């Protein structure tokens, strides 16, 4: 008279959990042959072949670089300039961004409607973006319109006209472009972080400028900016796709003949006004906003610094977690396991910015106002641990991830050409794929601790925060936790 093991609902719901678990016990050894969860370091030399990059310096100082792939049917060609927001004077602070929007509107040969129609009749595109140190103008076309595309970029950079009916109608496009980027809150955190870390230096200003500068800017200002900065040693013509190097050189030798001739380089302008880091903070409390956002940053490395590659391996150790991600509680990074297991944030991200003389290294996070204590403990605990205790599987995995993310990003004709043009401006050369992989795996566990002791250990920080941030710890709490009084 014991009940049989199918008679009660709770007894036969328990023989069905034991049968679900007996199919997790006999693994198939032919599905386990190549994959391994332990990271190793491997050699990628057989697959790293590429076409040749050919650089040619014209006698005025202009450089022309190409990577030809003659089996394609498209192309990308553009101009990279060594100028930006840093090289202005606070009475001309929005000028390099205003000049970007006023350069597709001029020309004595083709007006605004004619220029807009020549591009769309071909089926092409024409873009532009500004930053604090670099400007770009480039075009995506088909392979038979490359001489027409290069004809437009030379004429809109040399012979543009800026009339008053067009200037004043751009003052209301930009004054309404300001108002939308006052509501993205990741570009607002990172813009107050630059103004407090690099205060009283030219690197602390914003790109769009103050709103009083925009309603004052007139053509003269636009014309002295384009005669002081857009000069031949500070410009790179880069092309990629179905192009030929010797045919592009003869086109630019007769099209670019009339640009200015000032012999001031960019390095004479960085050296007479350098950038200096200051430990400080900004806090904007509102309490009607539901989520809080903040960033904490150390000073980092410049472009040509040999320690720059180790601050990119370290950024891949801190990692990234989001609430929609499929990794979940199982990620490699230990900062992402702390955030993920306890649910103490909405999202977390580590950043690393390089400049000509300085840089920034840190973490950005979004969270609910009752989680800010346990989140700030976990961020500071794992950054300071890089100066003390570094595992060997942590750096092998973070080297395999940085090798893969730098090359999976170069996919198509336009990622290739912005790789050529941006690297000739920062390093003076394009680094081949086999040297770049050789500098990455020369970063072992002892290299991590030595760069962490130079940049992180017992150093000043900069914080910018916004929202319901009354429970975020103060500056002395953060400054104290850059070292460990234990050991």
């Amino acid at each position: 008279s014991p009940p049989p093991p199918n008679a009660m609902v709770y007894d036969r719901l328990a023989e069905a959990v034991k049968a679900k678990l007996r199919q997790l016990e006999n693994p198939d050894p032919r599905f386990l042959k190549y994959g391994s969860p332990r990271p190793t370091l491997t050699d990628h030399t057989r697959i790293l072949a590429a076409p040749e990059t050919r650089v040619t310096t014209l006698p005025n100082g202009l450089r022309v670089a190409t990577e030809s792939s003659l089996a394609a049917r498209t192309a990308t060609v553009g101009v990279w300039i060594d100028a930006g927001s840093r090289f202005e004077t606070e009475e001309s602070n929005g000028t390099a961004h205003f000049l970007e929007h006023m350069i597709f509107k001029g020309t004595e040969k083709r007006n605004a409607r004619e220029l807009e129609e020549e591009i769309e009749n071909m089926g092409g595109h024409l873009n532009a973006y500004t930053s604090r140190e670099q400007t770009t103008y480039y075009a995506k076309v088909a392979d038979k319109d490359v001489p027409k595309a290069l004809d437009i970029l030379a004429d809109i950079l040399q012979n543009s006209r800026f009339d008053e009916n067009r200037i004043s109608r751009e003052r209301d496009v930009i004054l309404r472009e300001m108002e939308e980027v006052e509501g993205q809150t990741e570009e607002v955190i990172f813009d107050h972080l630059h103004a407090t870390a690099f205060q009283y230096t030219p690197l602390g200003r914003t790109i769009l400028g103050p709103a009083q500068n925009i309603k004052t800017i007139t053509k003269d200002h636009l014309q002295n900016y384009i005669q002081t900065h857009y000069t031949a040693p500070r410009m790179v013509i880069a092309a990629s796709g179905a192009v030929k190097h010797e045919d592009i050189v003869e086109q630019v030798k007769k099209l670019f003949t009339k640009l200015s001739t000032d012999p001031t380089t960019a390095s004479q302008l960085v050296a007479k006004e350098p950038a200096i880091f200051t430990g400080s903070e900004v806090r904007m409390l509102d309490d009607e906003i539901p989520l809080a956002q903040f960033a904490v940053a150390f000073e980092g490395a410049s472009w040509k610094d040999p320690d720059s590659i180790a601050l990119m391996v370290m950024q891949a150790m801190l990692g990234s977690w989001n609430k929609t991600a499929g990794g979940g509680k199982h990620m490699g990074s230990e900062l992402a396991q702390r955030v993920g297991i306890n649910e103490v944030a909405e999202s977390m991200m580590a950043f690393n910015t390089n400049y000509k003389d300085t840089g920034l290294f840190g973490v950005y996070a979004v969270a609910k106002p009752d989680c800010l204590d346990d989140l700030s403990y976990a961020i500071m605990y794992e950054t300071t641990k890089l100066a003390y205790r570094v595992s060997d599987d942590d750096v092998t995995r973070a080297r395999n991830q940085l090798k893969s993310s730098l090359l999976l990003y170069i996919d198509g004709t336009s990622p290739v050409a912005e790789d050529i043009g941006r690297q000739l401006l920062t390093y003076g050369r394009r680094i081949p794929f086999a040297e770049l992989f050789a500098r990455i795996d020369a970063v072992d566990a002892s290299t991590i601790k030595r760069v962490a002791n130079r940049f992180i250990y017992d150093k000043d920080i900069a914080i910018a925060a916004m929202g319901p941030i009354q429970r975020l710890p103060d500056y002395n709490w953060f400054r104290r936790r850059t070292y460990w009084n234990r050991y």
Partner: peptide, 29 residues
């Protein structure tokens, strides 16, 4: 790493001997 953890941690054993005879001079032992 983990060696440097203990390669630190056994000299606080000895920072504590510079300290353990600092006031008492435990003599006979």
């Amino acid at each position: 790493i983990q060696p440097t953890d203990v390669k630190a941690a056994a000299m606080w054993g000895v920072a504590a001997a510079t300290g353990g005879l600092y006031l008492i001079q435990p003599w006979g032992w």
